[PDB]
């Protein structure tokens, strides 16, 4: 069916004329890609784009031992 071989490539080239993502999204693709974009961040964490690690650690304080001896 090479007449069908040409007819699924030629209506693939029409999909390669794109402006803003989906062609017939409407309220469908706008809600779904925003529902999924939250879920990759919801149970994952709150993370910005480029912020480095900012913290500070304190070690164990070295106490002394009192000892009258001999």
């Amino acid at each position: 069916v090479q007449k069908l071989f040409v007819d699924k490539i030629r209506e693939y080239r029409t999909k390669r004329q794109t402006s803003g993502g989906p062609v017939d999204a409407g309220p469908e693709y706008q809600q779904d890609l925003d529902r999924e974009l939250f879920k990759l961040k919801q149970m994952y964490g709150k993370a910005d784009m480029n912020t480095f690690p900012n913290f500070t650690f304190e070690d164990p304080k070295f106490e002394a031992v009192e000892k009258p001896q001999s």
Binding site: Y44, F52, P53, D59, V65, Q69
Partner: protein
Amino acid sequence: IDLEKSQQALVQKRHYLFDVQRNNIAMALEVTYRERLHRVYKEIKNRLDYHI
């Protein structure tokens, strides 16, 4: 003999507690060293992991 050897073996017990103190604080300071590096090593992947 015992009162001489009571002070003899005591000062070998006094120096044991200073070998143990000198390596414990040297190591407990060192355990926080790479753990400071680990969390920055952790965080530089997580901002990469969120984008990919």
